[PDB]
């Protein structure tokens, strides 16, 4: 699947989401903890989607079908702990986008990543603005 720095960067950025979620899960909607967790998780998750976008662009002319599909596989995997935090249809968002634009090319991964980033931003904005 993924090789080289693309493998290192994407895996680390995906692990940064699960580290923060595990941080919140044992650190200590109108609940001020659910609100802050969604803002925190979407911040680090968005960084991961940007890295997905950057690495796909870098691999546009040289990446293979299996490399790009592995980036979607990572996006699907990181959507599960994000959905368990209360961001519903997070998995469906990336899974439906993969059906419309299958991740066999860099452009296909970018389309998937665009919808994932947009979803993560709406959740980030709605929860942050509720803090007030």
């Amino acid at each position, epitope marked *: 699947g993924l090789t080289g720095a693309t493998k290192i960067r994407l895996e680390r950025s995906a692990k940064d989401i699960t580290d923060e979620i595990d941080a919140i899960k044992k650190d200590a909607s109108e609940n001020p903890f659910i609100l802050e967790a969604k803002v925190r998780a979407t911040t680090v998750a968005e960084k991961f989607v940007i890295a997905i976008e950057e690495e796909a662009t870098k691999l546009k002319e040289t990446g293979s079908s299996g490399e790009f599909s592995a980036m979607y596989d990572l996006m699907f995997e990181v959507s599960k702990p994000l959905q368990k935090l209360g961001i519903q249809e997070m998995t469906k968002t990336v899974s439906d986008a993969a059906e419309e634009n*299958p991740p066999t090319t860099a452009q296909g991964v970018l389309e998937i990543a665009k919808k994932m980033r947009e979803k993560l931003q709406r959740v980030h904005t709605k929860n942050y603005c509720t803090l007030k």
Partner: antibody
Amino acid sequence: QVQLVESGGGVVQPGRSLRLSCAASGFSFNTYAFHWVRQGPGKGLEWVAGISFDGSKRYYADSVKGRFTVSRDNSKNTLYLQMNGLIPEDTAVYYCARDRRIVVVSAPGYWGQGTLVAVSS
Amino acid sequence: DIQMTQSPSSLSASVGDRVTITCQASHDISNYLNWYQQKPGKAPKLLIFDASYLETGVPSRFSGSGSGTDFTFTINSLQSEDIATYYCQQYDTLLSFGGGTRVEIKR
């Protein structure tokens, strides 16, 4: 037209090894992850092993972890399951299944007919 | 791990009845839950995916609901051909099945 044909079932003495294979045609074999599910005689379904669309991730149930290994060969469009140190509780019909979704590991969508393994002397 | 407990173990319903089956997950699994139907002598067939979405080609009489730990599978008008054992399946942590529910037909 999807077909999955398991093979390799029959009698194997306890504590020995048996290998199971599964043919693919016809679909995009490299697109999908695969699962192994077994069903003892008169018993329920037990998910045993799974492998991602690339062979980079393999997953095993606690009952077979460290004893079973699952592999794929995209060139031959076949899925493999190595069974070491067999015990009579492994007696079941083993099903090879293709994942319902593309790429990801979510759920066995298309199943084979299953092959019967009899762990007996 | 994640323990899937299915209920009832078996039931008897007449043709036309509304059959309901419950799955319970030991931990939160969101909606990463599927429902399978295994007719006698056959391999299991997926009917509901992601706990509430009907698979393409499945008759409308089957449905599913639930999220988190408690899940429900329903057959709106039970048909004679519907006799099978029904299994829930989670994919939150690895994959695993429930013990299954045997559906017999009262005639």
